[PDB]
DNA sequence: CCAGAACAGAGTGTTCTG
DNA sequence: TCAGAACACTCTGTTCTG
């Protein structure tokens, strides 16, 4: 019932992982797309509800690291 | 050389609200002081703020702006 | 149940003005 | 001079569809 990234409420298993769907369109966005994310911290950001938006880096280095798969 | 904002490094476009600060900076403040915002830092509270990084956290753009002087008083 | 599309909002940064 | 209004953009998040 909790996304494994953010600790959101979770919508059931998207790419592998159970996660929230704002989770799960991020990590598609990310995967594909073409960004520029910095993390501003030490990376070790915390990923939380409120603070999710913050650090883009360090969330999709926690979808990966939990095994987000596109092809899952 | 051209003028450099003291919260995010970029450049100045002036002196707002006391600081010297580029315009980004400048309207951030305003809607900061005046609005209701969700602002937590991700960190330890010492986020890097420049140009690339001044939207990852708020909470620290803030502190900057504060700690640098600014104020809507006059 | 889940992937992707369609739709919509939050936060930001610019130009324009007196 | 600098403070404010308002538009357009990116990144994001929810509802809809197959
Ligand atoms: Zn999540
Ligand atoms: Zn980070
Ligand atoms: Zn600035
Ligand atoms: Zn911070």
């Known amino acids: ?3 494994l990234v953010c600790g959101d409420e979770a919508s059931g298993c998207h790419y ?3 996660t929230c769907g704002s989770c799960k369109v991020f990590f598609k966005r990310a995967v ?5 994310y910095l993390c501003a911290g030490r990376n070790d950001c915390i990923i ?3 603070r999710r938006k913050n650090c883009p880096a360090c969330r ?3 979808c990966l690291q939990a ?3 596109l092809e899952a």
């Open 60 to 62: 999709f280095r926690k």
């Open 67 to 69: 095994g987000m798969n």
């Open 1 to 3: 019932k909790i996304c």
């Open 16 to 18: 592998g992982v159970l």
């Open 32 to 36: 594909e797309g073409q960004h520029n």
């Open 48 to 50: 939380d509800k409120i």
